[PDB]
Symmetry: none
Subunit: 266 residues, 4 copies
């Protein structure tokens, strides 16, 4: 029903908002509109601190009926229980297929909040949306879709490649895109490799998620300009979509990758 929900992670914040549920508390709302962006966070929701170090004084003042915690708040579950009952929905382990798990959590949250019908409408619409971008991608590339590298910059010299169990990997598979640089499953679906290792990617297309404060710095480097995919024009920037989000995150990133990959096409 209409309970007073406090989420402590950005993926759960998205999931709850997407279900038509409006929480009373959520972490890092200022950074949220820069990194996650896609599921706009209403004016009512108060910033209860960070995902790693939530404000216990503040969440208790909001009088929650439930506290939704994910992976990074697992050491606080006992602590959070002193304030209100906790529903722990973890994700993005080395074992979790992130995306699949994000959907199963999306369904579970729906049943608990009675918004079970709304969940089904969005999920089937997302699956239909996948094929829509896939169709628009083969119509622009010719039924042999290219191989794509999805990453986020770690430092101006280091890069987070997304692994096989990550959500961008799931998106690539749903779009019919190939994995230009596959990686074994890891936590959060990422692997930190050096940027110089991308000197050998002479074949596919490389997409990097926004924001990155030092984008110009890397772009102005001798190393980045020497990249095969850069001079060949097979590289673009994906509009800000949280790669560690919820179920609808898969959709938003699907529309974001496709839009950024329909560009820089032959």
């Amino acid at each position: 029903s209409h309970m007073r929900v406090v989420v402590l992670n950005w993926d759960l914040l998205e999931q709850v908002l997407e279900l038509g549920i409006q929480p009373v508390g959520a972490p890092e709302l200022s950074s949220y509109v820069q990194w996650v962006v896609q599921p706009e966070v209403p004016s009512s929701v108060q910033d209860i601190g960070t995902r790693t170090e939530p404000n216990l004084e503040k969440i208790a003042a909001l009088k929650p009926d439930v506290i939704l915690a994910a992976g990074p708040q697992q050491d606080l579950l006992a602590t959070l229980g002193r304030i209100a009952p906790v529903v722990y929905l973890p994700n993005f382990s080395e074992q979790d297929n992130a995306a699949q798990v994000a959907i199963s959590h999306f369904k579970t949250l729906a049943t608990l909040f009675g918004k079970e019908a709304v969940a089904q409408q969005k999920l089937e619409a997302m699956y239909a949306r996948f094929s829509e971008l896939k169709a628009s991608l083969q119509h622009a590339f010719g039924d042999t879709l290219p191989a794509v590298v999805t990453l986020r910059f770690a430092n101006p010299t280091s890069v987070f490649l997304y692994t096989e169990n990550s959500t961008p990997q799931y998106v690539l598979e749903q779009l019919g895109l190939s994995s230009a640089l596959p990686q074994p499953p890891k936590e959060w679906g990422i692997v930190q490799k050096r940027l110089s290792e991308l000197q050998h990617v002479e074949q596919g297309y490389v997409l990097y998620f926004l924001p990155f404060a030092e984008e110009k710095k890397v772009q102005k480097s001798v190393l980045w300009r020497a990249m095969p995919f850069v001079q060949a024009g097979r590289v673009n920037s994906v509009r800000p979509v949280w790669s560690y989000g919820g179920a609808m995150s898969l959709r938003y990133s699907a529309e974001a990758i496709t839009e950024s990959l329909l560009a820089v096409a032959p």
Copy 2:
């Protein structure tokens, strides 16, 4: 008869080659396509994939031991709560692949008491090596050609095998020269462009099967212009896992030799 669960294809071969039949093994469907040679019995159940094994299934089999390799190193802690784990890593940039695959074959033998069976196979392997070398010298020799061993990534990229790889080891055991040596790397491979094979004029090029885009590459525009292709010094090696166990060295030796005995003068 212990209840063994292997989580990697090399260990699966090693354990099977010792006459031991595990209760769990990864990617059994894909196994009969890429490694194929040590045929996995009908009894063994698919416990998921290599990189991403299913803990629920492995725990449901109630194993007495779990054999994990390199790609499962981040799961070792979790697996120990299911059953005692034997961690046998291999194919790093520092590992000589072949020796380590043999030493692991020996270690697995002693742990499982099948010490005699292991030695018998190893003696048969070394003997088979010299056998193939002789048959190569009777078809090429006494000056054996230089050979490139690779796997296709895509019709434009190629996985060349490095100095620490198992195909490199096989070539040296057959007395064959390395037509395109490479510095040590992880899993023993380097991904190069197909265009790099434009200057390997004198010698032989072998590529391992399967490759879904073989049909595309053989009649492809870039590949037919290759020197070793026009000279007819190129053939396809029957599917043998280049990242396997000890007996992989034998199977790949017999596979390369048989595929190289063809297209000979």
Copy 3:
């Protein structure tokens, strides 16, 4: 037996030989050695046979060696040295050499030649294992994002020797999972001489410089160095003396040296 009379002419080979349990009768610049290489302590018995660039042929021949180990910088003397004793030529720092890998490959080759193969494998396995520990200690104290590090040696108070992609400090950084923070294309000896002004744009990364450097205090109090972003942010430290152009065990000593100096000035 392998109880042989070895004369080394380069510091890396001196290290390789000492680490294998072999004690040479001659080695170059022993006085300067304990200041720059330091780590593999040179025994009291081994005599100083001159420098690396200009070895004393009269002295090395007087020691009556059974074998002479010469490296890259002594290649122009190989023909003359064979007249004294059989020579083993082990190069290791061109722009195409992966320095570290070959230093290990030379460590293995030298081991087999001197029969010290078992100790070599033991040393290498202990080094490789130590790498993962240091990497582990680095992902701890730091985020899920290993930092970007610049490794260099001071040439003068205004110029710096940055290490390239084929250098041994670079190999160490890569084994630790660290980024290059200022990568450079492969060059001879693994270095490039840049102006100190090149460190003006390494803002969010880390800068480490190897010891010794006689004018570090001079640079520390200099106007340009204090204006450096990594200096004001406190992300800069001095690495304890480890030879950047050494042998296989040089990689281990330099890995522990970099990690410890980078565990400091960490968040």
Copy 4:
């Protein structure tokens, strides 16, 4: 223990083979079985080109762990080191006593490759063989062994006399034979004199090493038949033994000279 060795000179090829070591590459294998012949090169060993001018492409293709170079390859040491570690064992200078150096190199190579025991056994067997041949030589020459000239034909008009620092000279001394025409130490242990100079070796023996493609031409020539040692019947042909080989070369040349000198005896 079992390394991949590539030798670039015939002497080093012999030394390594006598130690039970089997190289993967060796120079001039076709000509080797014509000039050196005794330490038979296995079928497995591949021809890496000629001496002085080795095939770098082939040597690198064999993936050697060591490259054994001698005198004539001294200008290639820098290039060879770029392929694999090089062990440079020079010999046959004006200062080298060839034979001693050939043995000391045989020992060092033995120590380096661990086949040290086999070396001492062979060397000790060689010294013992010397006295055996000397005895069979003294029983046929009246215990006062004659003076012998050892040479190789350059052309039908010139002859390569072997000097005091050469390996056949060492052989003559170990057999107790005198030097019927000694020469001051020179490079490769040889001196090129005109054939007309052998007119003065009257009261001695002359031995020439095989092969020589124009032996019949010289044998029926007017100048050679007019030689004092020829008319006196004190001349014979020594079976092919490499005068610039290794330690066991000294043995092979000892039994070859003795066998060729047991003939033409009174």
